[PDB]
């Protein structure tokens, strides 16, 4: 019933070890890029 249908999402950063816990100089995943990987995946993969 709103002015427009919008859906805003977040990654579930579960407080604990998801905070540079073991370094692993790899950068497990940058945020910015990860929003794009999900969105790339979100549009292209999911069949509702």
């Amino acid at each position: 019933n709103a002015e427009k249908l919008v859906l805003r999402i977040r990654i579930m950063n579960s407080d604990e070890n998801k905070m540079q816990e073991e370094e692993e100089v790899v950068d497990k995943m940058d945020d910015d890029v990860f929003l794009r990987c999900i969105e790339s995946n979100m549009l292209t993969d999911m069949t509702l």
Binding site: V25, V26, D27, M29, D30, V33
Partner: protein
């Protein structure tokens, strides 16, 4: 003002000879270079090509104070000659021929990414995720 009122007339000469060849040295306006900051300059033909065709190498304020590379334009008198017009104390104008056009551009200092030690290989593995760390490892 005089830009909107003054009316003058001056004589023009085109001498069949000069004591020095005249060239154009062009800069990008977007850089807005302060020529006052140029305490000194060195100017030499570029060494990559190892003469008259050689691109210029301009070193201002020392070897690494400021450095530009000048690349010759394709043509300068292919259809129309270019002249330098200079004002003389007698008010008369003097015209000088443009021999050549060189394009001058700015040049980053020390940085050095080899892109040959393993970076050509690393690209094959690249996930676009890192780039800084290789620069420290050198």
């Amino acid at each position: 003002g005089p830009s909107s009122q003054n009316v003058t007339e001056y004589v023009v000469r085109v001498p069949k000879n000069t004591t020095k060849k005249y060239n154009i040295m062009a800069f990008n306006a977007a850089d807005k270079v302060n020529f006052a900051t140029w305490n000194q300059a060195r100017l030499e033909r570029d060494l990559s090509n190892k003469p008259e065709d050689q691109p210029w190498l301009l070193r201002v304020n020392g070897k690494s104070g400021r450095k530009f590379k000048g690349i010759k334009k394709g043509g300068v008198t292919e259809n129309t000659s270019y002249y330098i017009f200079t004002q003389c104390p007698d008010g008369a104008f003097e015209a000088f021929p443009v021999h050549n056009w060189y394009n001058f551009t700015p040049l980053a200092r020390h940085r050095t990414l080899t892109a040959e030690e393993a970076e050509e290989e690393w690209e094959r593995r690249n996930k676009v995720l890192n780039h800084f760390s290789i620069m420290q490892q050198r």
